[PDB]
Structure formats: structure tokens, C-alpha cells
């Protein structure tokens, strides 16, 4: 099989004795990318002010969040230092080498600055066809308000400011597409219902005003236990993080 | 669930006239619709209320399915015929996988898919358990939530063709009514809880978004239904604000976020008007001459001025209004949109004041 | 009619098609049924079979016979069989095509073909008419020197046939085993002669199917009584074999020559 | 099935941290910054003696 | 800030009526004591003032484990949610 | 060459087609091979199979690459697979048709389809040239947001591929098991959305087949030395299943949208 | 991981001209680079964009390694030659432990380390599985994070020398392209999760620090 084809081997020395993927020297093993994809990373983070929400905030949504195992399309700007120099996390880098998947994701919503209550819904039959989130007053009514019968969780910030949920796989097909394009008209159906786990909506439930500094919502994510990165195609070409901010100014 | 969705629900009945020398012929399409657990809205008994929501009599399989996101399995279509031992015919009912309309549908094509042939010889009931033929395992529901949230289309089509035309005698009714009913097959399943596609009819009130509402400019109302020369030689109905000519009611500012193929529905008070429409070629579309309430409208643009064309508050009026709006959208010839516009008979009563309209759009 | 449903309707399924019948049939078989053995001596290429496509009951023609055109011996159908059936999908120029009907799709890519056939004739009259049809088959009849003389219903009574009593509204099935001068029929117009030779053969002309009036269709004199009645045909294949794989356009289909 | 669980709640006393003084003969709950979430300890060999703090 | 309670069935009869009408004078007794589980009252216990934004109370509910939907009669006619806010303005 | 006949030529037969090879191949498999189980949950209609038609090694394209247009990463082939192959028979208006090729004749009468594929790449160079090709496959690649970036031969080396050493003149076979978002692909343009809905899907686009230049084609500087070389492709299907019987014209085939 | 990093990735190819009477001589250095799982940036196919970041076509062993802090084991260097039965040569490829550049590198020194001698006589592919020779058990990755965060150097060097120069004939191409490829040996391992040295190329935009800008 050509991908691993090694003809006419010329090997001067014997192989190097094993450490069981680090288990001999350190106390743990490192043999599967799936394990690393289960270590949380930043999915999206933003600040929301009263001006971003509807004039009359009738317990409306704060964030409409599309759920992709390969993460969102990052926007590196002066306001987002992480995406600019850290770029994409490990999970989007891992995901890029595989075509398909079939599992769920585990999220962690951290809301700071708000004394009210937060509601979270999962819309598996309504996933976005764009790789960017929708904020506040730009969210359509169909999603801006709590829908019935969807799997949900409602949490008071007074008890805990961190929400922990696991989003399931509810798709009509065999696989979900990894690394999908937002420019897709020839296969809209694939992009619409065979790509994302369904939008996750994060809203507020109370009359408390938002501080002038605003509230900050940080969504971390990771792969669930039933998740699988399925068919290994090539890796795409990469960029180097050390080529964002140069070492010509070692401290900056 | 299986015990619920197994119960048959009634669909829109239809008449089958043996004396219709035009329709009662071999190859004629009697009845057809897409196959999915929720029935198409126009194949279900309805009750409309001015300024309120329509009530639909959904079958048990349709109600339950609107609670879940996915669906799959066979569907039992029971057909009940109002006949007696004199009547006779043969029908060919077919299940066409991967087709959503009858645009390319003929008997001589339908026979090339899964189908059954029924004989009406002293038989009044039979069931056509249709298959489930899909390129995937679960199929997304058709109707979803507000603003068509999470909606999609049906995967297949069912069609009833006339093989051997209906025969009666002189001492026997020449019309045979057919009542279609629907239930889930033994192999039917429902996947995933979602926002109900439906709501109860205990309260059919609804508050349309104020931001989408449009009306006539000040001084351009009250309005009435009438004619003017520069619009098909004043044979078609439009809304005027006076009897001097070029006094055609103008619409206020129409927001740019409104879809181009969208027609409109009256929200507040309205008017009654006498109109008609002759049967259109290749369709069963006609409006008999009668007094109808104004329920729908289509926007006719002439330069920087926007005018409104009236449509009757009737399920067929809803369809013709939508089709017309679509024709204006593709810049169809003005001469070819003419047969889809209600006729002018006589000026109607005026409105108490301005009339408010809200944007809507159908499949 | 003694039940809420009318009564029980008998059912016949083949492939993905289901036919319903309500009465006792009239049946016949054109010749002795058999399993072929000499077809294997005709082609060294493996004979393909497509039972889900060919064993399917397919709908043929509807023919409308009225009181005013129903005389003794009137021919409602006179067709070369199975040629007329397999070639029933024509274009604007009356040129047949095997490309749209799944049952006929193997005929487009094969040069030679063989099968047994069955023909059903459905008439759905009311309770108050009277008349009689005869559906008969004549093996390679058009090639006989007295073919036109065998067209009389008196002659049809002697060839394999079935009867339809309009007064009883019975269905009827005629089985037609394959019999031909060769162990295969041709699907298209191939191997015509040259300047000197004339070897010309019609595609799929195993015989002639007749549907004729045994007793003229009669009705009540009343105005609103149906003076017309449709006759519908269904056909299917039993042992369909195809051999001689070719491109679907290596050979053409001509406009079919009709019978007198 | 969704049976109720009316088992009485227990009284518990919240404290911000575990023992500061204890250094032996006890476990210490903590958030280990590792990929392996079990009881993990660095590897050893004769190249690396045992602690000579006796 | 979240209260969790289960409300029991304490009715003198066999069944409780589902989908009961508020316009009921011929069967007041049925409507009064054979329809609802009994009122639930939510009150405040303290002297603290209510903020100018006010307090918000959200009551969610679901069926208990001992609950049964009992006799299947027809479904009533329904309205469609996609006929509230139209898709003519897909974002609004 | 040491015999009266040149030497022994290896042979590979399938259906009624026989392919000859003379050298040791380069092989690979796109994904793990398996027997499908969830396809049965997609359609209640019985899945028809036509092994003598589909298991047939069929000839695809010939593509001619010259010395003057052979640069590193030059794309001799960039095609949606198996779409481009199944739809290789077009009319005057570049509209595909499934009616002439026996291997594709089941695609005309069925709505949904599935199979595993195998692709052979044949190059017949002389003894005096040098160069290298890479044939690779990318599952549903055109839908990926970085598809054009994966076109570089450095990226192709990581996806399933085979190599052709022009200096050795070896044949090469790439196995491509079926993997898709759904247990079936569509044969034609069906179930597009309506006024509100947009469910649009390309027929038979399981992925993208690449044939690119790993090492540019080089030749002797002599005038009468061939500066050109033809690259021919062959394809066949392993587990071809078809379901959803329809009339061959109930759905139409559009002019296919090309890749960048 | 082992199933991923075992897949060969392509490195920057190079031409080997038989008619170059200057370069095509015994002792000439054809190709050389430090040995480490991430390949040197200048030995990898690139795409540059004005005002944006460079795209690098990293092999699977390089991509995976950029996710972890440490690495160790043998590396398989497969060499593919664009030749036909007329071409002939002999190459000496060597693994020099503890060297990062060719500043003191000659054929007559390279022969004094672990090395292999390949004959191009009707052979187009061969693999040189190089050893892992280090003064420690794990070796820190070379490329790290922004501002060269946690970066280091490679431990060893691989070099290809001309033993017997390439020969062709007049009826045959005088240039033989060489395509180097890289994969992990069966003894390869990756220690410790760290900030990825890499990012996707879906968005190659970057905002350089305003404080460093000059004009």
C-alpha cells in the first residue's frame, strides 16, 4: 500500500528501545490524537453589551453558536490576540486530516459579569450554513427566543458561572462532514444537515441590566466519548505560529 | 406512539364525476401529492379566520410527527369510495421516489415505479401501503417552526391515475366521492424531539411583526377595488383611492428585507369585493363570479410608484396570489401574467380607513 | 356488496407492482410450457437475466370501444407481439426507444433476447351492459400466406384465446410460451443484407396479438348510460434472457411497419 | 421511567481548600494538570535514586 | 434561585379532565374539583424591596412518574407555527 | 524479449472484458474495506444488482501529456468521481445520458445508487523516457473549505494514491471503497428545494480523482523521439446496488458544473 | 498516532543534472538538512502571499509533531528518482549526530558516521531509515509558538553526497529529479501536548504588532 510503502530499506542501526509513548519516563501515554481532542480548547469568545441586544430584551438570546467539530473560521484581529498568534487550536488541526466524523461534542460556557440567569438550548435540526456565530439583535426570532421541546439546560449564575453540557449527534446520515466550506451551492443539502451538530443558543433569563463593561461569554469545547475522527485524507497546508509575532522583538 | 399514529386520519375528499367527458378519461390524474407523515397543507381540511391563523385538521400521524425532527417508514393510504354495485373503474396509484411534483408526471411514466392497480368492482375500501425509498435512513420533517425554522421537502410522490374510467348508469349517481385517509405502517418510526410544528387551536390569535407591516401613503386611502386603462385596458382588479384616473392607491415604503417573491395578507379591517377568474390552461384553477372578502395582495410596481392587486380570502386565492408574485419576480411577460389576475366586474365598497398588509410566502 | 368495504379483492404481486382482480378469469396457454435447452447452443456469451425488471407486470395500451363501432369481428387490437409492446415508447417521429421503461432497458444494450409472455386484459363495465371480447394470439402470423383470412373471429376461436364477458366483468390471462424459428429474437434492426444478400428480420415479432368483438357491445337506450368502454392490457415476461452486449446506439430502431 | 428521588439532602460544610498543614498519612484531592486523569506519577529507574531525605 | 417541587394528585374521583373549558356552567362541579391539581401559590417572605426592573418568575413543568394520559379521543385541529412569522423575511 | 512471442502478459478478466498487464503494479485503498449494513435502513424497495454490467472494467478517458506542458503539479485529471465517469457519454449540448453504456444503463431507471470503485491507470512509454505520475482520490473534496490548497502534489502524497514510474512503465490500481454522508448517492438532479427550501445535491459526487505530475515528463532531445505520452484510465464497480425504480425521464441530467 | 505519522509526506524535490561538469562530480553535496520530525521550512513546498502568512505543505509526521513538545525515534527518508534503465550513479547518504549545518561537512568526513551507499542501477526508490543519536531520551521540538516560544534546534544532520556521478546517454534525459519523502520509523514516539506550532490555512490573515511597525 503506497502511502506506507518502504522499498529497499537501508538501516545502519537497530531501532530505538521503546518508552511506551512516554509512559516510562513520564507517568502517562501519548499514542492517540483522540485523547488530545478530549482536552478542552477555546471555541468562541466575545463581549456583549446592551447595544448588541434587542431594544426590548425579552429574555432573548445572546449568542447563536454553530457547532463544528473542526471549530469556527477564526478571525485574527487586534481585539482577538489568541486567534491572531495562537491561531486554531489542536482540535481544528487534528480535524483537518480527516474527512468525516460521527459523535457528539462537550461544551463549557463561562459567563462573567451577569447576575441574571442563563438558558441554553440545542437545535439539532437547525444547524447554520456559515462558520461564524450570530450575536444579539442580529439573531432571527425563530432562534432569538426559547423554543419548546428541545434539549435544554437553565442555570442561575448565582450558584455557578460555568455551564457544562454535552451536545449529541442527531443527523439523518452516516457521517458528518469535517472541514466544510461556507461557499457551497452545488451541495447545499450536505452543508445544511450533514455538517454541523445543530446550533447552540445561549440566552439570558431575567430583567437585570448588563454592566457598562458588558458580559463576557467564553465557550470551550472538546470531543465526546462517542466521537470518532473517521476517514484519514491528507493534511492541508499549514501556517507557522512563529510567523505571526516575530522573535525579532523577543518581548512584546 | 405506534398505537397513536396507527389511527387513520381523514384527508381532503374529492369528487369523481362519471359524466365529465373531459376529465373522466384514461390517463387522467385524479389526485396527487408528496408523500410525508405531515400531510401537505392543501390536502387537509381547513378553517380560515380573517386576521387569525388557519386551523388544520391534521391526522394522528401528522400531529405526532410535528413533535419530532426525523421520520421514516411505510405509510398506509386508505381510499374510501362512495359507490354502489353499479359503478366500475380501474385506478393506478403509484409511488414515485425522488419526485416532489407532477410537472413531468404521466400515467405512462408512473407505471415505471412501485405502483398498484385497484378495481372498483363492488369494492369501496382498499389500502395502498406505500414504500419508503430514500438515499438516507432518516428523513427531515417538512414543516418546522416560525420563519420556516428547520424546514425541508418531501422525498417522494403519490399519484392516482385513471386506467379504466368510471362508469355509472342512468338510475344511479354519476358522482363518486373519494375519501383518502392516512396512517403509519407497522414499520414507522420517529427520531428526534424538536420545536412542535403545530400549536393548539384554543387560541388562534397571532401578532404579526410590526416592522414588516406596510400600508398606503397618507391621502391615498380609503381604498376600493376598481379598474384603470393602463392595466390590461381596465379589465383587471386593482385598489384605487379615487374615481379620477391615475388615482391608484400607492403603497408606503416597502422594506428591502422583504423577499421579492412574497405576497401579502391583510391584518386589520378589510373589504368585500366581487371578482372572477376564468379557468387557466393546464390547471384546475378558476374563481367563480361571487362576492369575496379581501385577504391577500400582490405588489405591482410601476417606476417609483408601488400599487396593490387584490385577491380573495380563499385557499385557491392564496395559491394564485403566490404564483403571480413569483411571475413578477422572474420578469415574466406582462401578457403572460394576465390570466392569473382577478377580473374587474364593478367598483366595490370603500374601506373605513387604511388597510394593513403583512409579508408571507409559500412553497 | 355486503360489507363496509365493498368486498374482498384478490391480489397478484410481481416485482414492485400489485394488480387487483375481483372475478374468476378466463385462461389459456399458446403452447406447451417448457424449459429451453438449445438457446445455450446459440451464444457463448453468458445470458443475463433481470427478473425484477422483466418479471414486472407492465401496463400496455388502453383501447376504447364504443357501441357505434362495435361490429362482429371488429379489431380493437391487432399488434405484432411482443414488438408493439416493447416499442410502445416513441418519440416525436414515432421512433421507438428502449431507454425509459425499466422493463425494456435491457433491450437497448443487448442484440438478442428471449422470454415467455403473459397478457392480461382488463375491462371494467357496469352491471347493465352486454357484450363479448376475444383475445387471441397467432405465432408469427403475419408471415403466413393466409394471415388476413385468419383475422375473422371464427378463426380466432381456434387459436389460443381467452374470453371477456362484459356481463360478468371477468378478467382474463393468456400465457404465451416462447416459440420462434430461432432460439432468440432480435431487439433491433440488425444484419440486413447487402448489395446481393437480403437477410432482413423484424425485431421481436414472435406473433400477432388480436383483441376482437365476439358479441357487439350493447347498452341501455338511455342518454346518460355509458356507450363506451375502455379495454386495458397488461404484459409481463417469465424467462427473460438477454445476450450479445452492445452499445445502446450501435444499432438503430426504425419506424415500425404496421399490419393491414 | 422517571422515578422521584425524595432521599433527604445531607448537611455539608463548605470550605475553600484542603489541608495546608498535612504532609504525610493522607490523600490530597487536587486538579492534576495532565492528560491522564488517574493517579499518575513520574517514571523512574536506577538512574534516578529514591528521595534521600531520611 | 431555582425551586424544585413535585405536585401530587389529590382529587376525589377516578380521572381528572384534560383540555377543560373555562366556559362551563352545566358541569361546574367537574370543572371545579375534577380538572386541576389545585392552585400553586408563590410568595415572598422578607422585607427586601423589589428592584425597579422587577423580579421575574419562570415556572417550568413536566409530567411526573405516576402520571398517565388515559383515554385517546381525537386530536383537535391545529395551527402551524410557520404561519406566525413568515419566511418572507427569513431574518427578523 | 527472449521468446518468439515477446514474453508472457498477465491477464485480468471481468464480465466479458479482458485486460492485459506486463509489469508489477502500484496499489492503494482509499479506506478500510467493509460490507455495508445501514443501506438496508434507507430503502424498503429491494436493491437490484447487475454484476455482469457493473463489475465490468470500462474504459474512461485518455489524456495526453506532453513535455512542454508537464510541470510539477500539472493536473492531467481533476474530476468528480464517479460523476465524471458515469456521465462521460454526452450529447451535442454536453448533456450526459445513461442510455448507451451497459455499465451505466441501471443509473437511468434508478433514483439512488451505491458501489465500491476501482481505478486503473495505463501508460505505455518506451524504454528511453523518464517521469512520474501520481493518481490520488479525495473523498467529497470539492466540499472542503481548503479544496484548492489540497491540489498540490505535496498534499496528494498524503491522500490515498498510486504512482506510475514512466521509467518502468508500471500499471497501477487504486481501490476506492464507498464512503459518503448517506448510504446512497443520487443518480440525477432530484429533490432540489422550493421557494423557501434549498436542498441541492450533485449526482454521484463521492469525491475527486486527481492525476498529477510528480516528476515532469522528459525525453531525448532528438527530433523523432516522442515528446508526448497518453494516459488512459479504466474504472469498474464492486458492490453496485440500485434502488428507487423510476421512468428514465422522470428526472433530468443537467450540464455538469466543472471544478476550478 | 503511529498510523498517521507512518504515512509519507513529500519534501522539496531537486534536479540532478548529468551534464553539469561542475557539480556532477565525486564528493559534491547534492542535498542536506537537519534531521527532525518537523521538516526545515526551506525543505518543504511553500506558497507565499503578500501581506499574509506563508503556507507550508507539512508531512503527517511534521503536523502531528507540532502538537507535542517532545519527540524521539528513527525517521524513514524515502528517496524517489526520476530515472530509467540507462541512468547510473552511486550516492552516499549519511547521518551526522550532533551537527546542525554543512559548514564543516565533506564526503571524506561523512563516511565517518552512520551512513548508507545507494546504487541507482535500475532502481528508482529506496529508504534510508536514519538512527536516533542523542545525549538525552526526548528531544525538544524545533518550531514552537509565537515569538519563537519554546523553540530549540535539531540534534543531527542528514547529507547526500555524490560517490559515483550520474551518467546518462544521448538518447535519454540528462536530468534526474529526486523527490525526498519522510515518515516515522516503527520506533517513533511523541511526548507532551503543547501549543500547536501550526495553524490551518483556511484563513492566512495576520495582524502584525502596530508597535513594531516602521516607515
How many angstroms is the resolution?
Answer: 2.6
Minimal CA–CA distance to A97: which of A67, A78, A117, A69?
A69
**CB neighbours of residue B285 within 10 Å:** 16
User: The C-alpha cell of A199 is what?
Assistant: 446550533
Q: What count of CB pairs under 8 Å joins B to F?
A: 103
β strands within chain E, DSSP E: 79-80
**CB neighbours of residue D29 within 10 Å:** 6
F42 touches chain B (CB under 8 A): yes
Check if the beta carbon of residue F12 is closer than 8 Å to that of residue F171. no
Residues of A in contact with B358 (CB under 8 A): none
Does residue B202 sit in the same domain as residue B231?
no
Minimal CA–CA distance to F136: which of F162, F109, F110, F166?
F162
Say which residue the cell 393466409 belongs to: C146
Minimal CA–CA distance to G168: which of G57, G92, G85?
G85
Q: What residues make up the domain containing B270?
A: 210-361
Tell me how the structure was determined: X-ray
Does residue B140 sit in the same domain as residue B236?
no
Check if the beta carbon of residue F112 is closer than 8 Å to that of residue F120. no
Please give the residue of chain F at the shortest CA–CA distance from G172. F220
Q: What share of chain A is helix, strand, coil (3-state, %, to 5)?
A: 15, 30, 55
Which residues are within 8 A (CB) of G134 and not within 5 positions of it... i.e. 6 or more apart? G72, G97, G155, G156
Q: What share of chain F is helix, strand, coil (3-state, %, to 5)?
A: 10, 40, 50
- At residue A165, the 3 state secondary structure works out as strand
Residues of A in contact with E92 (CB under 8 A): 140-141
Identify whether G214 is part of a domain: no
Does chain E reach chain A with at least 3 CB pairs under 8 Å?
Answer: yes
Identify whether G102 is part of a domain: yes
Does residue B150 sit in the same domain as residue B95?
yes
Residues of E in contact with A206 (CB under 8 A): 56
G207:A78 CB<8 A: yes
User: The C-alpha cell of E54 is what?
Assistant: 422587577
Name chain B's partners: 3 or more CB pairs within 8 A: A, C, E, F
Distance from CA of F103 to the nearest CA of G (A): 35
- At residue F216, the 3 state secondary structure works out as strand
What residue spans of G76-146 are helical by DSSP H? 107-110
Does chain C reach chain G with at least 3 CB pairs under 8 Å?
Answer: no
Taking the C-alpha atoms of residue B216 and residue B350, their distance in angstroms, rounded to an integer, is: 14
C53 touches chain F (CB under 8 A): yes
What residue spans of C152-247 are helical by DSSP H? 153-156
F43:B131 CB<8 A: yes
Name chain G's partners: 3 or more CB pairs within 8 A: A, F
Does residue B187 sit in the same domain as residue B249?
no
Taking the C-alpha atoms of residue E15 and residue A167, their distance in angstroms, rounded to an integer, is: 39
Does residue B88 sit in the same domain as residue B175?
yes
Residues of A in contact with B144 (CB under 8 A): 125-126
Which region holds residue C167: left if phi is over 0, alpha if psi is between -120 and 50, else beta?
Answer: alpha
Taking the C-alpha atoms of residue A97 and residue A37, their distance in angstroms, rounded to an integer, is: 13
For residue A55, give Cα distances in angstroms to A49, A50, A52, A59, C131: 12, 8, 9, 12, 82
Check if the beta carbon of residue C73 is closer than 8 Å to that of residue C153. yes
Q: What count of CB pairs under 8 Å joins A to D?
A: 21
Taking the C-alpha atoms of residue F259 and residue F80, their distance in angstroms, rounded to an integer, is: 8
Best mutation site among F44, F109, F246, F249 for testing chain C: the one with the most C CBs within 10 Å? F109
* Peptide bond connecting C82 to the previous residue in cis, omega within 30 degrees of 0: yes
How far is CA B106 from its chain centroid?
A: 21
* Residue that finishes a domain, picked among B206, B230, B264: B206
E86:B197 CB<8 A: no
Does residue B165 sit in the same domain as residue B185?
yes
Best mutation site among F144, F172, F180, F181 for testing chain A: the one with the most A CBs within 10 Å? F181
Best mutation site among C4, C10, C20 for testing chain B: the one with the most B CBs within 10 Å? C20
A125:B191 CB<8 A: no
Which region holds residue C147: left if phi is over 0, alpha if psi is between -120 and 50, else beta?
Answer: alpha
**CB neighbours of residue C210 within 10 Å:** 24
C 175-214 → B contacts, CB under 8 A: none
Taking the C-alpha atoms of residue B125 and residue B128, their distance in angstroms, rounded to an integer, is: 10
Produce one character per residue of C145-179: b if its CB has 16 or more CB atoms within 10 Å, e if not.
eeeeebbebebbeebbbbbbbbeebbbbbbbbbbe
Which residues are within 8 A (CB) of F123 and not within 5 positions of it... i.e. 6 or more apart? F133, F164, F166, F169, F229, F230, F231, F232
Please give the residue of chain B at the shortest CA–CA distance from F195. B363
How far is CA C182 from its chain centroid?
A: 20
Domain total in chain G: 1
Minimal CA–CA distance to F242: which of F29, F86, F84?
F86
Does residue B236 sit in the same domain as residue B156?
no
Does residue B249 sit in the same domain as residue B331?
yes
HEC profile of chain B: CHHHHCCCEECCCEEEECCCCCCCCCCCEEEEEEECCCCCHHHCCEECCCCCCCEECCCHHHHHHCCECEEECCEEEEEEECCCCCCEEEEEEEEEECCCCCCCCCHHHHCCCEEEEEECCCCCEEEEEECCECCCCCEECCCCEHHHECCCCCCEEEEEEEEEEEECCCCCCCEEEEEEEEEECCCCEECCECCCCEECCCCCCCCCCCCCCECECCCCCCCEEECCCCCHHHCECEEECCCCCCCECCECCCCCCCCCCCEEEECCCCCEEEEEECCCCCCCCCEEEEEEEEEEEEEEEECCEEEEEEEECCHHHHHHHHHHHHHHHCCCCHHHHHHHCCECCCCCCCCCCCCCEEEECCC
Per DSSP, F143 falls in state: G
A20 touches chain F (CB under 8 A): no
Q: Are strands F172-176 and F26-29 parallel, antiparallel or unpaired?
A: parallel
Does residue B171 sit in the same domain as residue B216?
no
Does residue B257 sit in the same domain as residue B235?
yes
CA atoms within 13 Å, Cβ hemisphere of B84: 8
- Per the DSSP assignment, residues forming a β-bridge with C29 are C175
Does residue B324 sit in the same domain as residue B268?
yes
Distance from CA of A231 to the nearest CA of D (A): 25
β strands within chain C, DSSP E: 10-14, 17-21, 26-29, 58-66, 75-82, 110-114, 117-123, 130-139, 161-165, 172-176, 185-186, 205-218, 228-237, 241-245
Q: What count of CB pairs under 8 Å joins B to E?
A: 110
How far is CA G130 from its chain centroid?
A: 12
Identify whether G30 is part of a domain: yes
Residues of F in contact with B114 (CB under 8 A): 45, 245
Does residue B199 sit in the same domain as residue B229?
no
Domains in chain F (CATH in brackets) are 1-260 (2.60.120.20)
Check if the beta carbon of residue F243 is closer than 8 Å to that of residue F111. yes
- Per the DSSP assignment, residues forming a β-bridge with A120 are A153, A202
- At residue A188, the 3 state secondary structure works out as helix
Taking the C-alpha atoms of residue B213 and residue B254, their distance in angstroms, rounded to an integer, is: 9
Amino acid at each position: 500500500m503506497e502511502r506506507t510503502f518502504t522499498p529497499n530499506v537501508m538501516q545502519p542501526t537497530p531501532l530505538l528501545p521503546t518508552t511506551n509513548d512516554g509512559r516510562v519516563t513520564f507517568g502517562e501515554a501519548f499514542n492517540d490524537l483522540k485523547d488530545l481532542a478530549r482536552r478542552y480548547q477555546l471555541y468562541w469568545e466575545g463581549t456583549i453589551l446592551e447595544g448588541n441586544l434587542r431594544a426590548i430584551r425579552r429574555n432573548s438570546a445572546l449568542v447563536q453558536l454553530p457547532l463544528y467539530p473542526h471549530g469556527l473560521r477564526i478571525q485574527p484581529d487586534v481585539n482577538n490576540p489568541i486567534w491572531n498568534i495562537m491561531r486554531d487550536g489542536h482540535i481544528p488541526v487534528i480535524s483537518s486530516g480527516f474527512r468525516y466524523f460521527r459523535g457528539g461534542l462537550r461544551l463549557r460556557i463561562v459567563v462573567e459579569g451577569l447576575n441574571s440567569c442563563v438558558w441554553v438550548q440545542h437545535h439539532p435540526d437547525r444547524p447554520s450554513i456559515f462558520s461564524r456565530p450570530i450575536i444579539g439583535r442580529y439573531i432571527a426570532a425563530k432562534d432569538a427566543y426559547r423554543n419548546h421541546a428541545y434539549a435544554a439546560y437553565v442555570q442561575n449564575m448565582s450558584v455557578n458561572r460555568t455551564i457544562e453540557v454535552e451536545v449529541p449527534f442527531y443527523q439523518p446520515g452516516l457521517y458528518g462532514m469535517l472541514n466544510a466550506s461556507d461557499n457551497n451551492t452545488a451541495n447545499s443539502f450536505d452543508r445544511l444537515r450533514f455538517t454541523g451538530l445543530g446550533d447552540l443558543l445561549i440566552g439570558i433569563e431575567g430583567e437585570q441590566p448588563i454592566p457598562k463593561e458588558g458580559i463576557e461569554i467564553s465557550v470551550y469545547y472538546s470531543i465526546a466519548d462517542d466521537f470518532s475522527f473517521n476517514i484519514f485524507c491528507g493534511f492541508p497546508p499549514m501556517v507557522y505560529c512563529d510567523e505571526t509575532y516575530s522573535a525579532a522583538t523577543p518581548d512584546l | 406512539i405506534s398505537g397513536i399514529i396507527g389511527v387513520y386520519g381523514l384527508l381532503k375528499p374529492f369528487d369523481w364525476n362519471a359524466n365529465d367527458t373531459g376529465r373522466n378519461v384514461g390517463g387522467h390524474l385524479l389526485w396527487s401529492m408528496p408523500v410525508h407523515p405531515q400531510v401537505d397543507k392543501d390536502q387537509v381540511i381547513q378553517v380560515m379566520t380573517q386576521s387569525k391563523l388557519t386551523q388544520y385538521y391534521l391526522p394522528p400521524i401528522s400531529v405526532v410527527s410535528s413533535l419530532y425532527a426525523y421520520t421514516r417508514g411505510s405509510i398506509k393510504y386508505k381510499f374510501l369510495f362512495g359507490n354502489n354495485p353499479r359503478h366500475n373503474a380501474r385506478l393506478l396509484v403509484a409511488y414515485i421516489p425522488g419526485i416532489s411534483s407532477d410537472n413531468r408526471l404521466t400515467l405512462e411514466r408512473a407505471r415505471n415505479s412501485a405502483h398498484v392497480v385497484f378495481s372498483l368492482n363492488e369494492v369501496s375500501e382498499f389500502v395502498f401501503t406505500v414504500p419508503y425509498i430514500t438515499d438516507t435512513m432518516w428523513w427531515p420533517r417538512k414543516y418546522g417552526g416560525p420563519q420556516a425554522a428547520g424546514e425541508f421537502v418531501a422525498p417522494s410522490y403519490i399519484c392516482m391515475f385513471i386506467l379504466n374510467p368510471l362508469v355509472a348508469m342512468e338510475s344511479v349517481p354519476s358522482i363518486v366521492t373519494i375519501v383518502p385517509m392516512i396512517a403509519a405502517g407497522d414499520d414507522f418510526e420517529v427520531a428526534v424531539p424538536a420545536q412542535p410544528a403545530v400549536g393548539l387551536s384554543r387560541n388562534i390569535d397571532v401578532i404579526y411583526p410590526k416592522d414588516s407591516i406596510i400600508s398606503f401613503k397618507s391621502g391615498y386611502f380609503p381604498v376600493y377595488v376598481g379598474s384603470w386603462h393602463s392595466f390590461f385596458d381596465s379589465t383587471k382588479a386593482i385598489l384605487r383611492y379615487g374615481a379620477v384616473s391615475d388615482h391608484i392607491a400607492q403603497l408606503g415604503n416597502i422594506p428591502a428585507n422583504v423577499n421579492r417573491k412574497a405576497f401579502w395578507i391583510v391584518v386589520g379591517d378589510t373589504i368585500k369585493f366581487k371578482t372572477k377568474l376564468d379557468k387557466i390552461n393546464g390547471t384546475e384553477w378558476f374563481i367563480p363570479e361571487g362576492e369575496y372578502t379581501l385577504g391577500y395582495g400582490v405588489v405591482w410596481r410601476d417606476g417609483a410608484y408601488a400599487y396593490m392587486v387584490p385577491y380573495p380570502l380563499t385557499p385557491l386565492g392564496e395559491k394564485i396570489a403566490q404564483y403571480t408574485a413569483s411571475l413578477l419576480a422572474s420578469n415574466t411577460a406582462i401578457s403572460q401574467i394576465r390570466p392569473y389576475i382577478p377580473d374587474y366586474i364593478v367598483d366595490s365598497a370603500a374601506s373605513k380607513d387604511n388597510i394593513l398588509w403583512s409579508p408571507i410566502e409559500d412553497r | 356488496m355486503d360489507r363496509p368495504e365493498g368486498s374482498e379483492e384478490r391480489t397478484v404481486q410481481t416485482s414492485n407492482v400489485v394488480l387487483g382482480e375481483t372475478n374468476i378469469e378466463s385462461q389459456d396457454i399458446a403452447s406447451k410450457e417448457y424449459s429451453p435447452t438449445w438457446d445455450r447452443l446459440a451464444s457463448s456469451e453468458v445470458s443475463d437475466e433481470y427478473p425484477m425488471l422483466t418479471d414486472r407486470w407492465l401496463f400496455w395500451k388502453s383501447v376504447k370501444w364504443e357501441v357505434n363501432d362495435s361490429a362482429f369481428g371488429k379489431m380493437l387490437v391487432q399488434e405484432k407481439f411482443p414488438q408493439s409492446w416493447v416499442q410502445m415508447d416513441v418519440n416525436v417521429n414515432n421512433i421507438p426507444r428502449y431507454t425509459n421503461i425499466p422493463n425494456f432497458i435491457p433491450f437497448n444494450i443487448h442484440q438478442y433476447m428471449r422470454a415467455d409472455f403473459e397478457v392480461k386484459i382488463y375491462v371494467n363495465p357496469n352491471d347493465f351492459v352486454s357484450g363479448w371480447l376475444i383475445m387471441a394470439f397467432l405465432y408469427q402470423g403475419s408471415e403466413m400466406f393466409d394471415y388476413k383470412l385468419r383475422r375473422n373471429p371464427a378463426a380466432l376461436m381456434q387459436m389460443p384465446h381467452v374470453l371477456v364477458n362484459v356481463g360478468a366483468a371477468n378478467e382474463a390471462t393468456l400465457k404465451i410460451p416462447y416459440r420462434y424459428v430461432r432460439p432468440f429474437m432480435r431487439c433491433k434492426d440488425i444484419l440486413r443484407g447487402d448489395n446481393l444478400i437480403t437477410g432482413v428480420t423484424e425485431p421481436l415479432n414472435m406473433g400477432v396479438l388480436f383483441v376482437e368483438v365476439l358479441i357487439p357491445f350493447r347498452t341501455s337506450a338511455a342518454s346518460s348510460a355509458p356507450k363506451s368502454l375502455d379495454v386495458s392490457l397488461f404484459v409481463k415476461m417469465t424467462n427473460a434472457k438477454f445476450t450479445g452486449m452492445v452499445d445502446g446506439s450501435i444499432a438503430l430502431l426504425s419506424k415500425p411497419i404496421a399490419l393491414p | 421511567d422517571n422515578p422521584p428521588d425524595p432521599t433527604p439532602a445531607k448537611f455539608f460544610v463548605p470550605i475553600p481548600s484542603h489541608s495546608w498543614a498535612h504532609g504525610t498519612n493522607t490523600s490530597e484531592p487536587t486538579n492534576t494538570l495532565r492528560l491522564d486523569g488517574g493517579v499518575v506519577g513520574v517514571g523512574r529507574s536506577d538512574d534516578i535514586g529514591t528521595s534521600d531525605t531520611a
